[PDB]
């Protein structure tokens, strides 16, 4: 039973515990139970995998999970999403640097505590529901079935502090007819290290992250699948999830709407980053593999392709993709004897109304 | 000092129908986290209802239609201190006004807030 604890600006205090047993009872199958807790998320799963579905090396694995998400604690317009479901996925190895995934999933979503807002209600209207705009004490449940696929490319020279090679992850999903929702969702992550000097102490890192999803036949993608940008892992110098559309709230009685700086996310995202890794200035004793220093330029955007700017002239056009946030700063990573250490200082030099600045960001971790 | 987060309401009292009152609320002790803060109220016969909220950044302000246009919620320059300026009051504003705090985004439901104050009485005479 292995644990882990962490503390950072993006998710607060993280707790992790799990255990893995292979060849369970001499049957070939592997079993595991894993759980994670955030300031905004509690997650737990149970998996049973067969690495010999075919002699060719194809694996057939199952998953049973529950997830509780409290959007207010992630700094989004308030709502609660308690979900659970199952997943069956095949994994195909292609070569040393490539692998594929194909699977089917079921997921139930229980939504509650939705503070009425325009974009969120636009999705609900597309689902035939007509909840009041004056009551946060509401409820909406869905049951979906999905096809899931993924591709992983990885040819790095080493896992920790890579100096050369690229990493690419592609994931996609789409609902199967008969589900409640009708939509698709795709994401692309890339990272490319290029060494400048012969000794690989000066390195250029280029990272990209893309996401796009949309509904089918009148329906929209559910707001609880939105993408988010801003924070330590996307655009440093911005508070986690602040980048993109902000909530437009309905009035409360027990066309007059309220502006806000509460992020909500969007169904389209584009994030890029250029990082210049250098040797640490006074720590170059020739055994400096424990620290990595870099300067970076981050940028990203998140928009709502279904925002109807004409009906909401008094409020920004949240469908425009061109409001590109940008930042620049410094970062230090350290494999210290107390655990992994990462911190950065960044300044946003391109902001938009409502965006929340967070110049200093860090993450601390311990594994036992 | 206190053994937990404490919210202390100040202001309030007796005012004429068309008068004004300024309430305040402050998180006692030392809190290193920024809180969204809100005002609720419970009338003599009715149940506890929402009045106004303001985000931690103060960028989001929200009122119930009853008091919209008459009340004004604002964050003080100090840590986690909010005020509620109530103008053109009315006998239907009489109630115990409670202060509520919350880390993360604001909300209208009382169960979403993590800390509450003891409340202050507000009385409006016809
Ligand atoms: C290495 C894990 C350390 C976990 C505790 C760190 C301190 C957490 O403080 C939270 C303060 O929030 C207020």
CA torsion sign for B107, B111, B112, B117 is positive
Residues A151 and A98 sit within 8 Å (Cβ to Cβ) = yes
- A51-61 in b/e form (b: 16+ CB < 10 A) is beeeeeebbbb
Write out the two tokens for A332. Answer: 């230090």
Cα dist. B75→B23, B60, B103 in Å? Answer: 12, 11, 15
Find chain A residues with C-beta within 8 A of B62's C-beta.
249, 252, 258, 260
Question: Which helix (H) or strand (E) segment is B37 a member of?
Answer: strand B36-42
Query: Phi-psi region for residue B112, left (φ > 0), alpha (ψ -120 to 50) or beta?
Result: alpha
Q: Residue A113 maps to which CATH number?
A: 2.40.160.50
Determine the distance from the C-alpha atom of residue A166 to the mean position of all C-alpha atoms in its chain, rounded to a whole number.
Answer: 20
What span, in angstroms and rounded, lies between the C-alpha atoms of B106 and B75? 14
Method: X-ray
Determine the distance from the C-alpha atom of residue A45 to the mean position of all C-alpha atoms in its chain, rounded to a whole number.
Answer: 18
User: Which residue from A235, A107, A246, A102 is spatially nearest to A175, judged by alpha carbons?
Assistant: A107
Gap from CA of A13 to ligand 1 centroid (Å): 6
CB pairs under 8 A between A and B: 66
User: Which residue from A138, A10, A13, A8 is spatially nearest to A81, judged by alpha carbons?
Assistant: A138
Write out the two tokens for A59. Answer: 């694996």
CA torsion sign for A18, A22, A24, A30 is positive
Write out the two tokens for B36. Answer: 């969204």
Burial (CB < 10 A; 0-12, 13-18, 19+), residue A134, is: middle
Question: What is the DSSP code (8-state) at residue A47?
Answer: E
Residues A39 and A13 sit within 8 Å (Cβ to Cβ) = yes
Which residues, 6 or more positions from A115, have their beta carbon under 8 angstroms from its beta carbon?
A: A77, A78, A79, A136, A247, A249, B105, B107, B108
Write out the two tokens for A137. Answer: 């004490």
Residues β-bridged to residue A141: A110
Query: Phi-psi region for residue B70, left (φ > 0), alpha (ψ -120 to 50) or beta?
Result: alpha
Gap from CA of A362 to ligand 1 centroid (Å): 12
Determine the distance from the C-alpha atom of residue A296 to the mean position of all C-alpha atoms in its chain, rounded to a whole number.
Answer: 21
> Is residue A90 within 6 Å of ligand 1 at its C-beta?
no
Burial (CB < 10 A; 0-12, 13-18, 19+), residue B107, is: buried
- Atom of ligand 1 lying closest to residue A12 CA: 10
Cα dist. A240→A74, A203, A296 in Å? Answer: 8, 27, 18
Which residues, 6 or more positions from A177, have their beta carbon under 8 angstroms from its beta carbon?
A: none
What span, in angstroms and rounded, lies between the C-alpha atoms of B46 and B34? 32
Determine the distance from the C-alpha atom of residue B54 to the mean position of all C-alpha atoms in its chain, rounded to a whole number.
Answer: 10
DSSP labels, A99-133: EEEEEEEEEEEEEE----BHHHHHHHHHTT----S
CA torsion sign for A301, A304, A309, A312 is negative
Mapped onto helix, strand or coil, the DSSP state of residue B7 is strand
What span, in angstroms and rounded, lies between the C-alpha atoms of A62 and A152? 19
What span, in angstroms and rounded, lies between the C-alpha atoms of A262 and A276? 33
What span, in angstroms and rounded, lies between the C-alpha atoms of B51 and B48? 10
Instruction: Give the other-Cβ count within 10 Å of A158's Cβ.
Output: 10
Find chain B residues with C-beta within 8 A of A261's C-beta.
55, 57, 59-60
What span, in angstroms and rounded, lies between the C-alpha atoms of A166 and A156? 6
User: Which residue from B44, B3, B52, B40 is spatially nearest to B118, judged by alpha carbons?
Assistant: B40
Instruction: Give the other-Cβ count within 10 Å of A124's Cβ.
Output: 19
Residues A114 and A138 sit within 8 Å (Cβ to Cβ) = yes
Chain B contacts in chain A segment 58-77 (CB below 8 A)? 70-77
Find chain B residues with C-beta within 8 A of A356's C-beta.
57
Write out the two tokens for A302. Answer: 């998140």
Find chain B residues with C-beta within 8 A of A78's C-beta.
104-107, 112
Identify which of A13, A14, A38, A365 to mutate to test ligand 1's pocket (most ligand atoms within 8 A of the CB).
A13
Cα dist. A210→A119, A188, A227, A297, A321 in Å? Answer: 21, 5, 9, 17, 13
Residues A60 and A101 sit within 8 Å (Cβ to Cβ) = no
Residues β-bridged to residue B24: B10, B83
Residue B79: φ, ψ to 5°: -65, 130
Residues B122 and B94 sit within 8 Å (Cβ to Cβ) = yes
Write out the two tokens for B21. Answer: 């009152």
User: Which residue from A165, A167, A136 is spatially nearest to A153, judged by alpha carbons?
Assistant: A167
Determine the distance from the C-alpha atom of residue A202 to the mean position of all C-alpha atoms in its chain, rounded to a whole number.
Answer: 29
Write out the two tokens for A199. Answer: 């000794």
Gap from CA of B102 to ligand 1 centroid (Å): 18
Mapped onto helix, strand or coil, the DSSP state of residue A15 is strand
User: Which residue from A205, A202, A346 is spatially nearest to A272, judged by alpha carbons?
Assistant: A205
CA torsion sign for A156, A157, A162, A165 is negative
What span, in angstroms and rounded, lies between the C-alpha atoms of A224 and A338? 36
Mapped onto helix, strand or coil, the DSSP state of residue A321 is coil
Residues B112 and B38 sit within 8 Å (Cβ to Cβ) = no
Domain that holds residue A27: 1-368
Residues β-bridged to residue A195: A203
DSSP labels, A245-261: -B--BPP------B---
Write out the two tokens for A202. Answer: 């000066």
Instruction: Give the other-Cβ count within 10 Å of A324's Cβ.
Output: 15
Contacts 24+ apart (CB under 8 A), A100-105: A100/A149, A100/A150, A100/A151, A100/A152, A101/A148, A101/A149, A101/A150, A101/A151, A101/A152, A102/A147, A102/A148, A102/A149, A103/A147, A103/A148, A103/A149, A104/A145, A104/A146, A104/A147, A104/A148, A104/A176, A105/A145, A105/A146, A105/A148, A105/A173
What span, in angstroms and rounded, lies between the C-alpha atoms of B124 and A41? 45
Cβ-based interface (< 8 Å): residues of B facing A: 49-50, 55, 57, 59-66, 68, 102-109, 112
Touching check for A261 and chain B: CB below 8 Å?
yes
DSSP labels, A122-188: HHHHHTT----SS-S--EEEEEEEEEEEEEEEEEES-SSS--SEEEEEEEEEEEPTTSS--EEEEEE
User: Which residue from A30, A27, A8, A7 is spatially nearest to A18, judged by alpha carbons?
Assistant: A30
Q: Do A251 and B65 touch (CB under 8 A)?
A: yes
User: Which residue from A348, A318, A75 is spatially nearest to A238, judged by alpha carbons?
Assistant: A348
> Is residue B32 within 6 Å of ligand 1 at its C-beta?
yes
Mutate to test the interface with A, among B104, B106, B110, B113 (most CBs of A within 10 A): B104
Question: Which helix (H) or strand (E) segment is A344 a member of?
Answer: strand A339-350
Instruction: Give the other-Cβ count within 10 Å of A320's Cβ.
Output: 12
What span, in angstroms and rounded, lies between the C-alpha atoms of A102 and A123? 28
Instruction: Give the other-Cβ count within 10 Å of A159's Cβ.
Output: 7
Residues A276 and A294 sit within 8 Å (Cβ to Cβ) = yes
Question: What is the DSSP code (8-state) at residue A9?
Answer: T
Q: What is Dmax (Cα atoms) for chain A?
A: 70
Residues A275 and A207 sit within 8 Å (Cβ to Cβ) = yes
Query: Phi-psi region for residue A11, left (φ > 0), alpha (ψ -120 to 50) or beta?
Result: alpha
Structural domain total, chain A: 1
What span, in angstroms and rounded, lies between the C-alpha atoms of A43 and A11? 14
Q: Do the strands B120-125 and B13-16 form a parallel or antiparallel pair, or are they unpaired?
A: parallel
Residues A361 and A346 sit within 8 Å (Cβ to Cβ) = yes
Q: Do the strands A357-358 and B95-102 form a parallel or antiparallel pair, or are they unpaired?
A: unpaired
Place of tokens 């040393």: A96
How many CA atoms within 13 Å lie on the side-chain side of A71? 26
Partner residue facing B60 (CB), from A76, A252, A261: A261
């Amino acid at each position: 039973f292995n644990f882990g604890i962490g503390y950072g600006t993006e998710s607060g205090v993280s707790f992790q515990a799990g255990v893995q047993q292979d060849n369970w009872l001499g049957t070939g199958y592997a079993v595991g139970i894993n759980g994670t807790k955030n300031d905004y998320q509690t997650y737990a799963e149970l998996s049973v995998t067969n690495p010999y579905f075919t002699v060719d090396g194809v694996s057939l694995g199952g998953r049973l999970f529950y997830n509780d998400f409290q959007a207010d604690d992630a700094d989004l317009s308030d709502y609660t999403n308690k979900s659970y479901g199952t997943d069956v996925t095949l994994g195909f190895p292609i070569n040393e640097y490539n692998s594929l995934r194909a699977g089917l999933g079921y997921v139930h979503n229980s939504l509650s505590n939705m503070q009425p807002q325009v974009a969120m209600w636009r999705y609900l209207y597309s689902m035939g529901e007509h909840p009041s705009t004056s009551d946060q004490d509401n409820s909406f449940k869905t049951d979906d079935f999905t096809f899931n696929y993924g591709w992983t490319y990885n040819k790095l020279d080493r896992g920790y502090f890579p100096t050369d090679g690229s990493r690419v992850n592609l994931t996609g999903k789409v609902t199967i007819p008969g589900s409640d929702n009708e939509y698709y969702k795709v994401t692309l992550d890339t990272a490319t290290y290029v060494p400048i000097d012969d000794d690989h102490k000066w390195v250029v890192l280029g990272r990209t992250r893309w996401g796009y999803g949309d509904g089918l036949g009148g329906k929209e993608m559910p707001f609880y699948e939105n993408f988010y940008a801003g924070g330590s892992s996307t655009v440093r110098g911005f508070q986690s999830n602040t980048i993109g559309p902000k909530a437009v709230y309905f009035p409360h009685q027990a066309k007059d709407l309220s502006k806000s700086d509460d992020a909500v996310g969007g169904n389209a995202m584009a994030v890029a980053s250029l990082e210049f890794i250098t040797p640490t200035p006074f720590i170059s004793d020739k055994y400096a593999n424990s620290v990595r220093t870099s300067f970076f330029w981050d940028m990203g955007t998140v928009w709502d392709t279904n925002w109807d700017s004409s009906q909401y002239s008094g409020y920004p056009d949240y469908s425009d993709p061109s409001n590109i946030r940008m930042s620049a700063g410094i970062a230090l990573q350290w494999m210290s004897p107390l655990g992994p250490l990462v911190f950065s200082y960044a300044q946003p030099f391109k902001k938009y109304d409502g965006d929340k600045a967070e110049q200093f960001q860090f993450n601390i971790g311990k594994t036992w | 000092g206190p053994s937990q987060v404490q919210l202390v309401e100040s202001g309030g009292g007796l005012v004429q129908a068309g008068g004004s009152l300024r309430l305040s609320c402050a998180a006692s002790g030392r809190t290193f986290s920024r809180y969204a803060m809100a005002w609720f109220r419970r009338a003599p016969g009715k149940e506890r209802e929402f009045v106004a909220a303001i985000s931690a950044s103060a960028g989001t302000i929200f009122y119930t239609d009853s008091v919209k246009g008459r009340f004004t919620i604002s964050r003080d320059h100090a840590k986690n201190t909010v005020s509620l300026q109530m103008n053109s009051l009315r006998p239907e504003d009489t109630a115990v006004y409670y202060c509520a705090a919350k880390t993360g985004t604001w909300a209208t439901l009382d169960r979403r807030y993590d800390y509450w104050g003891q409340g202050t009485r507000v009385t409006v005479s016809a």
